[PDB]
Design a protein around this ligand. Structure first.
Ligand SMILES: N[C@@H](CCC(=O)O)C(=O)O
Ligand code: NA
Ligand code: NA
Length: 238
């Protein structure tokens, strides 16, 4: 059986969540996609889903993927963004889900988008465990003093409501999929400006894994048939 790392998510469980009363039993969009894709392969793939994370906060997804390079995981299934530092250590599938960063802010915010958020003095929120932190630092040179990690949609909402004046944020940078789920439950907030990154979600396997190439064909089969959108819509639908 393959040891498949799964992120032990504390928020936005629609993507992946551990089943109550179990360590190794998971449900969600990412798990349905995987299950769908494996069923199109010419060979059996017996798995053990191993939770990665402390159960209190969403894990570092980069660190989850690194456990492939150490041989602790045979691969990783979840909402894993196919970003460059990750692609240098493991082999991702074709993307099964479109993603990328947006700016989330209050209705009347003076922020026009990422460029305006940039030159500001104020805190920016990001999601616990996300690449979004290194992107803000490496790509936009935002001071670490300004970057606030936020673990839950409830923490997102409190931080935006409070604002910089009360130990909150002026805005949150997070990938569109989580943000759509957030705004669905928190209709006071908006995306400001354009999606300014475009990395999708992939399944991660060891470099030169045949399973990453076989699963890519299977994912292209799900997308071409409309099933990928069907799976997306059954888990994700102001
Ligand atoms: N999809 C995010 C992880 C989200 C989270 O922080 O839980 C990533 O690939 O980095
Ligand atoms: Na499921
Ligand atoms: Na094989």
């Amino acid at each position: 059986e393959l040891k498949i790392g799964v992120p032990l998510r504390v928020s936005y469980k629609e993507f992946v969540s551990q089943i109550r009363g179990t360590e190794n039993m998971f449900k969600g969009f990412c798990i349905d996609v995987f299950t769908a894709a494996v069923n199109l392969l010419p060979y059996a793939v017996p798995v053990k889903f191993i939770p990665y994370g402390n159960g209190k906060e969403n894990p570092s997804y980069t660190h989850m993927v690194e456990m492939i390079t150490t041989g602790n995981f045979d691969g990783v299934v979840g909402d894993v963004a196919i970003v460059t530092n990750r692609t240098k250590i493991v082999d991702f599938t074709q993307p099964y889900a479109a993603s990328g960063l947006v700016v989330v802010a209050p209705g009347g915010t003076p922020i026009k988008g990422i460029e305006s958020l940039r030159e500001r003095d104020d805190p920016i929120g990001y999601q616990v465990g996300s690449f979004a932190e290194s992107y803000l630092r490496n790509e936009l040179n935002i001071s670490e003093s300004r970057l606030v990690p936020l673990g839950t949609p409830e923490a997102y909402a409190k931080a935006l409501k409070d604002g910089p004046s009360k130990g909150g944020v002026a805005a949150i940078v997070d990938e569109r999929p989580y943000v759509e789920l957030f705004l669905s439950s928190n209709c006071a907030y908006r995306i400001v400006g354009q999606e300014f990154t475009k990395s999708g979600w992939g399944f991660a396997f060891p470099r030169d894994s045949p399973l990453a190439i076989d699963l890519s064909t299977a994912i292209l089969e799900l997308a071409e048939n409309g099933d990928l959108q069907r799976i997306h819509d059954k888990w994700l639908m102001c």
